[PDB]
Enzyme design. Structure first.
Site, PDB file in Angstrom:
ATOM      1  N   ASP A 143      -4.833   0.871   9.722  1.00 53.45           N
ATOM      2  CA  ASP A 143      -4.731   2.136   8.899  1.00 53.45           C
ATOM      3  C   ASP A 143      -5.993   2.560   8.401  1.00 53.45           C
ATOM      4  OD1 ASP A 143      -3.038   4.032   7.685  1.00 53.45           O
ATOM      5  OD2 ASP A 143      -2.291   2.900   5.843  1.00 53.45           O
ATOM      6  N   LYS A 145      -8.655   4.893   7.113  1.00 52.54           N
ATOM      7  CA  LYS A 145      -8.651   6.243   6.488  1.00 52.54           C
ATOM      8  C   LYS A 145      -9.368   6.459   5.331  1.00 52.54           C
ATOM      9  CE  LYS A 145      -4.152   6.607   4.714  1.00 52.54           C
ATOM     10  NZ  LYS A 145      -2.816   7.274   4.921  1.00 52.54           N
ATOM     11  N   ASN A 148      -7.491   5.111   1.921  1.00 51.12           N
ATOM     12  CA  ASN A 148      -7.275   3.757   2.092  1.00 51.12           C
ATOM     13  C   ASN A 148      -8.574   2.633   1.673  1.00 51.12           C
ATOM     14  OD1 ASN A 148      -4.703   3.714   2.342  1.00 51.12           O
ATOM     15  ND2 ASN A 148      -4.663   3.111   4.486  1.00 51.12           N
ATOM     16  N   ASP A 161      -4.711  -1.033   1.202  1.00 53.04           N
ATOM     17  CA  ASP A 161      -3.141  -0.787   1.468  1.00 53.04           C
ATOM     18  C   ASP A 161      -2.821  -1.474   3.018  1.00 53.04           C
ATOM     19  OD1 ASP A 161      -0.784   0.176   2.695  1.00 53.04           O
ATOM     20  OD2 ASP A 161      -0.782   1.771   1.004  1.00 53.04           O
ATOM     21  N   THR A 181      -2.384   7.033  10.609  1.00 52.49           N
ATOM     22  CA  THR A 181      -2.908   8.732  10.694  1.00 52.49           C
ATOM     23  C   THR A 181      -3.614   8.678  12.030  1.00 52.49           C
ATOM     24  OG1 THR A 181      -3.323   8.660   8.442  1.00 52.49           O
ATOM     25  CG2 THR A 181      -4.358  10.249   9.677  1.00 52.49           C
TER      26      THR A 181
HETATM   27  C1  LIG Z   1      -5.980   7.361  -5.507  1.00 51.13           C
HETATM   28  O1  LIG Z   1      -6.706   7.880  -6.627  1.00 51.13           O
HETATM   29  C2  LIG Z   1      -7.234   7.103  -7.507  1.00 51.13           C
HETATM   30  C3  LIG Z   1      -7.026   5.747  -7.476  1.00 51.13           C
HETATM   31  C4  LIG Z   1      -7.792   4.883  -8.417  1.00 51.13           C
HETATM   32  N1  LIG Z   1      -7.681   3.444  -8.411  1.00 51.13           N
HETATM   33  C5  LIG Z   1      -6.911   2.559  -7.629  1.00 51.13           C
HETATM   34  N2  LIG Z   1      -6.929   1.115  -7.520  1.00 51.13           N
HETATM   35  C6  LIG Z   1      -6.107   0.777  -6.600  1.00 51.13           C
HETATM   36  C7  LIG Z   1      -5.614  -0.402  -6.264  1.00 51.13           C
HETATM   37  C8  LIG Z   1      -4.736  -0.424  -5.037  1.00 51.13           C
HETATM   38  C9  LIG Z   1      -4.307   0.802  -4.677  1.00 51.13           C
HETATM   39  C10 LIG Z   1      -4.603   2.147  -5.392  1.00 51.13           C
HETATM   40  C11 LIG Z   1      -3.986   3.120  -4.364  1.00 51.13           C
HETATM   41  C12 LIG Z   1      -3.702   4.271  -5.204  1.00 51.13           C
HETATM   42  C13 LIG Z   1      -3.018   5.370  -4.806  1.00 51.13           C
HETATM   43  C14 LIG Z   1      -2.981   5.717  -3.385  1.00 51.13           C
HETATM   44  C15 LIG Z   1      -3.364   4.638  -2.592  1.00 51.13           C
HETATM   45  N3  LIG Z   1      -3.610   4.646  -1.299  1.00 51.13           N
HETATM   46  C16 LIG Z   1      -4.264   3.386  -0.852  1.00 51.13           C
HETATM   47  N4  LIG Z   1      -4.482   2.655  -2.087  1.00 51.13           N
HETATM   48  C17 LIG Z   1      -4.018   3.348  -3.295  1.00 51.13           C
HETATM   49  C18 LIG Z   1      -5.500   2.116  -5.906  1.00 51.13           C
HETATM   50  O2  LIG Z   1      -5.923   3.111  -6.749  1.00 51.13           O
HETATM   51  C19 LIG Z   1      -8.610   5.452  -9.279  1.00 51.13           C
HETATM   52  C20 LIG Z   1      -8.445   6.771  -9.483  1.00 51.13           C
HETATM   53  O3  LIG Z   1      -9.252   7.337 -10.523  1.00 51.13           O
HETATM   54  C21 LIG Z   1      -9.939   6.447 -11.483  1.00 51.13           C
HETATM   55  C22 LIG Z   1      -7.889   7.440  -8.616  1.00 51.13           C
HETATM   56  O4  LIG Z   1      -7.928   8.918  -8.713  1.00 51.13           O
HETATM   57  C23 LIG Z   1      -6.947   9.549  -9.297  1.00 51.13           C
END
Ligand SMILES: COc1cc(Nc2nc3cccc(-c4cccc5nc[nH]c45)c3o2)cc(OC)c1OC
Length: 302
Positions: A143, A145, A148, A161, A181
């Site tokens: 995955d 992209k 991620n 992820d 994707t």
């Molecule tokens: C995805 O957007 C963000 C993630 C994070 N931080 C974050 N730490 C993570 C640890 C594991 C997974 C996610 C995550 C969060 C949201 C969507 C995701 N797609 C893949 N991983 C994703 C994290 O997202 C911080 C952000 O701003 C400070 C942020 O912008 C809104």
């Protein structure tokens, strides 16, 4: 032997121990939230919490949440997210992971349109070590992209992820699923003929092309046309790309996975020794000793 009819006692991690602050986004099978630990030794610590809802009926998303948990417990790498807790309640599964303060690479890419070759070389170099670590454990990431790829407070990357990944791929074994994707999929994933770790190196090339140009190399009017364009693999090479970038892209975009850069006997070393990465000290990079390109009052009376 006769069974001793007694039960072990443990203080169980529960979602009530994590104060919900905000929604961060959407992972492969559920929402990801920013939470703050309430009790215990790690009280006041920020974490990302991924939640799988109505897990009892969602059999496919549940099996893969368990694999994701198993992958994260096994892995120990600078560029792979750390899992701190995993627990469940009736109809819900929870993963508590590092909170990456820098947000995702997609947000940065969207703002800049495209990255400089120096920035791309940095991101891809850290990503190549992360992918190779996974491959060494018999995992296909699948995955890739920019959504991620997350950035920490220093600007270093983390893969976060693993819901669509595949475990136990070694020797002559192949995976046959069609998940991820479409634009990043290798031709062998698209035509359903079976894929191995070498599919990740095709995806790595797509990500490289997208970061350097701001566009995807194989894409049509809809997902079905994009699929046939991946199978034809007729690449239009933008003329601002360096000869080193053009060589790496042509070496990764081999439709036959057996001929692809990184699929040879030397594996990841085929990529690490490519002229595109000649300025990278891979040891310093692994030690997080390379400076990333991006790192995420009025009153006066002296
Ligand atoms: C995805 O957007 C963000 C993630 C994070 N931080 C974050 N730490 C993570 C640890 C594991 C997974 C996610 C995550 C969060 C949201 C969507 C995701 N797609 C893949 N991983 C994703 C994290 O997202 C911080 C952000 O701003 C400070 C942020 O912008 C809104």
């Amino acid at each position: 032997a006769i069974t001793h009819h007694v039960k072990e006692g443990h203080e169980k991690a529960d979602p009530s121990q994590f104060e919900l602050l905000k929604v961060l986004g959407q992972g492969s099978f559920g929402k990801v939230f920013l939470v703050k630990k309430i009790s215990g030794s790690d009280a006041r610590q920020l974490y990302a919490m991924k939640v799988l809802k109505k897990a009892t009926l969602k059999v496919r998303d549940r099996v893969r949440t368990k694999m994701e948990r198993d992958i994260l417990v096994e892995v120990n790498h600078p560029f792979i997210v750390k899992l701190h807790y995993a627990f469940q309640t009736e109809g819900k599964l929870y993963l508590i992971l590092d909170f990456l303060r820098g947000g995702d690479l997609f947000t940065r890419l969207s703002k800049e349109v495209m990255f400089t070759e120096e920035d791309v070389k940095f991101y891809l170099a850290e990503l190549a070590l992360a992918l190779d670590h996974l491959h060494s454990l018999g995992i296909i990431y699948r995955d890739l992209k920019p959504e991620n790829i997350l950035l920490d407070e220093e600007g270093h990357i983390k893969l976060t992820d693993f819901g669509l990944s595949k475990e136990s791929i070694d020797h002559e074994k192949k995976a046959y699923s069609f998940c991820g994707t479409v634009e990043y999929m290798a031709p062998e994933v698209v035509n359903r003929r079976g894929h191995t770790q070498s599919a990740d190196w095709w995806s790595f090339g797509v990500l490289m092309f997208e970061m350097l140009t701001g566009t995807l190399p194989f894409q049509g009017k809809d997902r079905k046309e994009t699929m046939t364009m991946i199978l034809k693999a007729k690449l239009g090479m933008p003329q601002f790309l360096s000869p080193e970038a053009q060589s790496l892209l042509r070496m990764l975009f081999k439709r036959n996975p057996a001929n692809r850069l990184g699929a040879g006997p030397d594996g990841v070393e085929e990529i690490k020794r490519h002229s595109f990465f000649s300025t990278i000290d891979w040891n310093k990079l692994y030690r997080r000793e390379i400076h990333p390109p991006f790192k995420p009052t009025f009153y006066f009376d002296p």
